[PDB]
Coordinates of C-alpha atoms in Angstrom, one line a residue:
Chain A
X1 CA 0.0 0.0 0.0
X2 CA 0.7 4.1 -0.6
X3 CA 3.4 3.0 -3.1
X4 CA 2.1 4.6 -7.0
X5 CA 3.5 2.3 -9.6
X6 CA 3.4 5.5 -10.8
X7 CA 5.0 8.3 -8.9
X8 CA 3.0 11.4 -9.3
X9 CA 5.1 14.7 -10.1
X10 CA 4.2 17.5 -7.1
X11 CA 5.1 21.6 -8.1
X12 CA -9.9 21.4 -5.8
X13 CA -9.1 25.0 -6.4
X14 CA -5.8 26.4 -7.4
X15 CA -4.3 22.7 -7.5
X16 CA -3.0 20.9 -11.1
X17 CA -3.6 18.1 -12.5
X18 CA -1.8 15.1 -11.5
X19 CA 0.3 12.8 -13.6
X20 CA -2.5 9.7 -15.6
X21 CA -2.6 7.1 -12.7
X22 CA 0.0 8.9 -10.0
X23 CA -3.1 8.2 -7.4
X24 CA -4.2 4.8 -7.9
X25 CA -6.4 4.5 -5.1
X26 CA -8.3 7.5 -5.7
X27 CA -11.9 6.2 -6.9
X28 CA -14.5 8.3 -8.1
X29 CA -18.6 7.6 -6.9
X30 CA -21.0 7.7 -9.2
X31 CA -24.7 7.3 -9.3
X32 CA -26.0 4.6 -12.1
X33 CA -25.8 7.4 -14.9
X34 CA -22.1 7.7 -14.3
X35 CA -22.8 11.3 -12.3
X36 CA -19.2 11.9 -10.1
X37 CA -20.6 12.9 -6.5
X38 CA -18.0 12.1 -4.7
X39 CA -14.3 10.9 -4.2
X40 CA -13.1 7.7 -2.2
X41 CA -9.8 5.9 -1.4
X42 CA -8.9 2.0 -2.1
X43 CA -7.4 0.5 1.1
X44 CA -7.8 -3.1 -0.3
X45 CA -9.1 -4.9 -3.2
X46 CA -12.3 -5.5 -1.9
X47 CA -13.3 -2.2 0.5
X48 CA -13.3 1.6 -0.6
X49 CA -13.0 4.4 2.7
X50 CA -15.1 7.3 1.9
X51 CA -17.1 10.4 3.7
X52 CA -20.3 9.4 5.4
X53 CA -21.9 12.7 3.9
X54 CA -21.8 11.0 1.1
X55 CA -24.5 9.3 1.3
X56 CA -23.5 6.6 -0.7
X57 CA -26.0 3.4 -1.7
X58 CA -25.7 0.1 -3.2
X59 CA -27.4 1.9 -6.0
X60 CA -24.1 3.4 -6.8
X61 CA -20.8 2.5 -8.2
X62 CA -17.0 2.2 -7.2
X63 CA -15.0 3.9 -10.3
X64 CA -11.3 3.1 -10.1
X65 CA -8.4 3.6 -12.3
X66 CA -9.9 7.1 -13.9
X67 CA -7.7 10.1 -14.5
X68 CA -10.0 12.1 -17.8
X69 CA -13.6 11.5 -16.8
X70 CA -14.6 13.0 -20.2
X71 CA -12.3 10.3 -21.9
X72 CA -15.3 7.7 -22.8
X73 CA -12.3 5.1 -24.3
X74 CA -10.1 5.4 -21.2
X75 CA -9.7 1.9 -19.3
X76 CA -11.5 1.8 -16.2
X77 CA -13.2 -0.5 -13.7
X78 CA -17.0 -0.3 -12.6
X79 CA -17.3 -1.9 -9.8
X80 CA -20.9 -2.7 -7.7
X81 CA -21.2 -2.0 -4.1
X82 CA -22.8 -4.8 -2.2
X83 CA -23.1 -3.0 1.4
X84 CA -22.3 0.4 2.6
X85 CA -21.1 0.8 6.2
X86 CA -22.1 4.0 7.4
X87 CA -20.3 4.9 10.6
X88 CA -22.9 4.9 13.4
X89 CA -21.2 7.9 15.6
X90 CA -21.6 9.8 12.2
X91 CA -23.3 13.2 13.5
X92 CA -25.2 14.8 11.0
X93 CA -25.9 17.5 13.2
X94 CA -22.0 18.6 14.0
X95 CA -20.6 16.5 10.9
X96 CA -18.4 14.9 13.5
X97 CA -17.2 10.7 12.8
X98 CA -17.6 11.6 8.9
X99 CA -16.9 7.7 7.9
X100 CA -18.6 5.0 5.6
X101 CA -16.9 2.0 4.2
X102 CA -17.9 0.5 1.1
X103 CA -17.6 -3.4 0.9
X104 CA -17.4 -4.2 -3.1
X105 CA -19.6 -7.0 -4.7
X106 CA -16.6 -8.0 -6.5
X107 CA -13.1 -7.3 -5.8
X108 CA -11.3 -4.5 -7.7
X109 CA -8.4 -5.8 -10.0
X110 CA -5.3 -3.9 -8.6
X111 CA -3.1 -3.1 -11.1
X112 CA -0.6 0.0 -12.0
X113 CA -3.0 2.6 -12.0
X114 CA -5.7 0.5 -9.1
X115 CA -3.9 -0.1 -5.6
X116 CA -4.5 0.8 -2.1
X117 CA -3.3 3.5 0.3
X118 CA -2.0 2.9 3.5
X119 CA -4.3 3.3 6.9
X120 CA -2.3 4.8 9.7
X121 CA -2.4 3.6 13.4
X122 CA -4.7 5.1 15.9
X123 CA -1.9 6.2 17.9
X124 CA 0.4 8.1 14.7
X125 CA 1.0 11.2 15.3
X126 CA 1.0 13.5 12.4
X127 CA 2.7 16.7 13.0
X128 CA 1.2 20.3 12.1
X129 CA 3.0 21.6 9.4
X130 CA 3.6 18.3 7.5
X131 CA 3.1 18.8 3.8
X132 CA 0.6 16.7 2.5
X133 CA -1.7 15.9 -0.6
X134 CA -5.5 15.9 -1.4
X135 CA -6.5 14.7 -4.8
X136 CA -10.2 14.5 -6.3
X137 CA -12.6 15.7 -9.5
X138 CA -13.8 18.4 -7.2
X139 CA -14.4 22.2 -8.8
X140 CA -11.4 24.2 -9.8
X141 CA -12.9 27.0 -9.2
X142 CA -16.4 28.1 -6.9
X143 CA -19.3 25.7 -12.6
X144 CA -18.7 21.9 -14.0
X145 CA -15.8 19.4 -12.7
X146 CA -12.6 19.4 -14.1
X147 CA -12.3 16.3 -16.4
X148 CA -8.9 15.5 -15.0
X149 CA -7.6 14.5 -11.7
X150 CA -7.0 17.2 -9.4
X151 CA -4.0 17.0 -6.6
X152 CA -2.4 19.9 -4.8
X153 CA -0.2 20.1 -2.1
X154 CA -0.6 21.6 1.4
X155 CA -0.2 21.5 5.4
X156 CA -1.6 19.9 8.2
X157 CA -2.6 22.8 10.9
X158 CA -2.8 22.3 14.6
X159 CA -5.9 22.3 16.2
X160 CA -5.4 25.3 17.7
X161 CA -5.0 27.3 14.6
X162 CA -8.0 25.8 12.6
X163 CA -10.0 26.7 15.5
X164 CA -8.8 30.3 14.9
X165 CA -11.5 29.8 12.3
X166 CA -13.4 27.9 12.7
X167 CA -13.8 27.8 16.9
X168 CA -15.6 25.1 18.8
X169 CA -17.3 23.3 15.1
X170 CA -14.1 21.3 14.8
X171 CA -14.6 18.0 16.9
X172 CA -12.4 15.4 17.7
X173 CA -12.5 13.1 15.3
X174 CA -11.5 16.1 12.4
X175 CA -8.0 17.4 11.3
X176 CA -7.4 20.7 9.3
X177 CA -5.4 21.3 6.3
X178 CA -5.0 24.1 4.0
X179 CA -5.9 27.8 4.3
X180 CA -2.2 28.1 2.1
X181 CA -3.2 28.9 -1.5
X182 CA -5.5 25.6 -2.2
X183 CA -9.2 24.4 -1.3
X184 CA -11.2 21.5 -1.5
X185 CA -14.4 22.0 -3.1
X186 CA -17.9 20.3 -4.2
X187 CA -17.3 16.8 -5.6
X188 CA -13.9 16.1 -3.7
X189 CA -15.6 14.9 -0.6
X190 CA -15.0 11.5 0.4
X191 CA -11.3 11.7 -1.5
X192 CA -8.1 11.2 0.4
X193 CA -5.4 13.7 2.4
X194 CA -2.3 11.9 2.3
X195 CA 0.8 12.0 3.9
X196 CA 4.2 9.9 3.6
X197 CA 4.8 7.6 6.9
X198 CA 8.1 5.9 6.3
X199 CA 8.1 7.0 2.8
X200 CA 4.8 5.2 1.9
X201 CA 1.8 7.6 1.0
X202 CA -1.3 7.2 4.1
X203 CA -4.2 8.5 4.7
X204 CA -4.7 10.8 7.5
X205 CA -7.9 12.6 6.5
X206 CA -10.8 12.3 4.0
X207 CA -12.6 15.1 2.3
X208 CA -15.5 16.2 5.0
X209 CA -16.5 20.3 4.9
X210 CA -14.7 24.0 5.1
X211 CA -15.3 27.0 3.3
X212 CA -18.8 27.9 1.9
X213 CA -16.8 29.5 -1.3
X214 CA -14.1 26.7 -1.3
X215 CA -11.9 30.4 -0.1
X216 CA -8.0 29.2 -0.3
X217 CA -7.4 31.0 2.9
X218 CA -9.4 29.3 4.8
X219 CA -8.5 25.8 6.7
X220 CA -10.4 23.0 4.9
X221 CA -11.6 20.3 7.5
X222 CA -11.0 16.3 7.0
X223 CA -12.1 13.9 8.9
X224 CA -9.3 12.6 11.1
X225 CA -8.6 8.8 10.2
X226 CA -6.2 8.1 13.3
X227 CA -9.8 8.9 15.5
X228 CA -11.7 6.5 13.2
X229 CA -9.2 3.9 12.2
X230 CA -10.1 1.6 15.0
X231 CA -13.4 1.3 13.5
X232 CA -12.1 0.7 10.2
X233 CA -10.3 -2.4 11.6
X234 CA -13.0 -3.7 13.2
X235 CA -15.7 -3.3 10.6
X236 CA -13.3 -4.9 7.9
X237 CA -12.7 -7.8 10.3
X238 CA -16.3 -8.4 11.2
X239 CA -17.3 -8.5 7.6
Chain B
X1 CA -50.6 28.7 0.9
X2 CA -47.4 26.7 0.7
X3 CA -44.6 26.7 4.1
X4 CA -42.2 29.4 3.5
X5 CA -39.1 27.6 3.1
X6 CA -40.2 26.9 -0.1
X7 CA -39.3 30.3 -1.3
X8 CA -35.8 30.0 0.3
X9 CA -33.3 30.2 -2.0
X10 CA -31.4 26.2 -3.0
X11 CA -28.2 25.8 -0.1
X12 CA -25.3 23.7 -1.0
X13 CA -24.0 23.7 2.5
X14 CA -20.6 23.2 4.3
X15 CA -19.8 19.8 2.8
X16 CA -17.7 18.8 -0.5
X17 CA -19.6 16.8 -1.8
X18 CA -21.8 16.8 -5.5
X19 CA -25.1 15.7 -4.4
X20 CA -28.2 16.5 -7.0
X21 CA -30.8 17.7 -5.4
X22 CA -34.1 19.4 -5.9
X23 CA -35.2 23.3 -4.8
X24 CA -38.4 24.8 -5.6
X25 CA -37.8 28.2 -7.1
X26 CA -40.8 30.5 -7.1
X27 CA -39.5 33.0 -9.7
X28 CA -40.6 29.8 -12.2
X29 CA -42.9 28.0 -10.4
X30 CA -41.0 24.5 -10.7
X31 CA -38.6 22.6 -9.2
X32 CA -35.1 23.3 -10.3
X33 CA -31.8 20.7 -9.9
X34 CA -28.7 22.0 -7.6
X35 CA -25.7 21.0 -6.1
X36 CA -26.1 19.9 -2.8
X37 CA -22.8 19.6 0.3
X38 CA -24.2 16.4 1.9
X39 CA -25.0 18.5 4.7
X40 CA -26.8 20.6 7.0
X41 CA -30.0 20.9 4.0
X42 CA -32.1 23.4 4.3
X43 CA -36.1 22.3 3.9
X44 CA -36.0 23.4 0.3
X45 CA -34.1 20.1 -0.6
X46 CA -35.8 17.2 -2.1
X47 CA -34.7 13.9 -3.6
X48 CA -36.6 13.9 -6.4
X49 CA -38.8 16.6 -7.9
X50 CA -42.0 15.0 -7.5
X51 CA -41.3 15.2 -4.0
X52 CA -40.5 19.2 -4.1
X53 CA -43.7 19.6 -6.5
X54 CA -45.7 17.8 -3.6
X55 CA -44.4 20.2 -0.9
X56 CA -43.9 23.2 -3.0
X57 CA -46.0 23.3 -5.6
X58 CA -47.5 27.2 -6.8
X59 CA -45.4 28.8 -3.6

């Protein structure tokens, strides 16, 4: 896992587009028309981590190995959901526990542009300030999606500078990033914040809320994987 | 007389996400498509636009 075939080449709004591939367990949700709603991460061949926001069905579909979603002759893989684990603690109220898992009917054929990123431990301890990465098909600007995939580079902030902001909304289980030049916007939800552990890439947040205007000066919010990874584990085990 | 949220203009909300939703927009007098967060939805927010029509019909 967090190991691109592919390595991606590093210089949403204000990001750029990422090398074909470079983010091969970035998945894109659709809805049975092939509508992109929302962004998710492979951590295995058979389960896809995404935003519990989302609200994703068994209705829709798992879309890996995409880079040009307007390329109808690009290679991809469609693959059928057969259960979605919404995170119980999921607050819809405060937006806190913003988890779902998606269990696939069939398993995903890994490949050079289709692998799985690594899940940190509950106890890692990413430092404020750490550069990281947040890809997706979200909007470039605050409007249609941009065909390609998005990534763009930015840092982790302490808790007590996202609440600067954004005060006593940020809960426990989310992380900030951003407010540097970038922003996630509507349709990366659900995607992946990265960072290198030990070289390989893991994610340490997924695509939750922020900015109204997707505002680049603004800290986005994630939710915070380390505070929901224990979950992960033991819904993956249990099913 | 239709509730008054139904002349509330369509919100997107917080969230990232690309939902389509439905708003009932008065200035036409149907239900119109938007891009809902996945979050915090106002009452003007329906699933489908039957359901919106139902609700919000001639508001």
């Amino acid at each position: 896992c967090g190991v691109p075939a592919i390595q991606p080449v590093l210089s949403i709004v204000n990001g750029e587009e990422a090398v074909p591939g470079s983010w091969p367990w970035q998945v894109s949700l659709q809805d049975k028309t092939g509508f992109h709603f929302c962004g998710g991460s492979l951590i295995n061949e058979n389960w896809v981590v995404t935003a519990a926001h989302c609200g994703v069905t068994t209705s829709d579909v798992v879309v890996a190995g995409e880079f040009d979603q307007g390329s109808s002759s690009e290679k991809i893989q469609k693959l059928k959901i057969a259960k979605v684990f919404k995170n119980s603690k999921y607050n819809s109220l405060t937006i806190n526990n913003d988890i779902t898992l998606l269990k696939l009917s069939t398993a995903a054929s890994f490949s050079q542009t289709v692998s799985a990123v690594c899940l940190p431990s509950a106890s890692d301890d990413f430092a404020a300030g750490t550069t990281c990465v947040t890809t997706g098909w979200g909007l470039t600007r605050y409007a249609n999606t941009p065909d390609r995939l998005q990534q763009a580079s930015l840092p982790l902030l302490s808790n007590t500078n996202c609440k600067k902001y954004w005060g006593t909304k940020i809960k426990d289980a989310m992380i900030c990033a951003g407010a540097s030049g970038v922003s996630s916007c509507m349709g990366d939800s659900g995607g992946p914040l990265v960072c290198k552990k030990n070289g390989a890439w893991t994610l340490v947040g997924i695509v939750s809320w922020g900015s109204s205007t997707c505002s680049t000066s603004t800290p986005g919010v994630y939710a915070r994987v380390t505070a929901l990874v224990n979950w992960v584990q033991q819904t993956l085990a249990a099913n | 007389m239709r509730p008054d949220f139904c002349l509330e203009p369509p919100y997107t909300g917080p969230c990232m996400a690309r939902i389509i939703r439905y708003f009932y927009n008065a200035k036409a007098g149907l239900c119109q498509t938007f891009v809902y967060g996945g979050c915090r939805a106002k009452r003007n927010n329906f699933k489908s636009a039957e359901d919106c029509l139902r609700t919000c019909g001639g508001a």
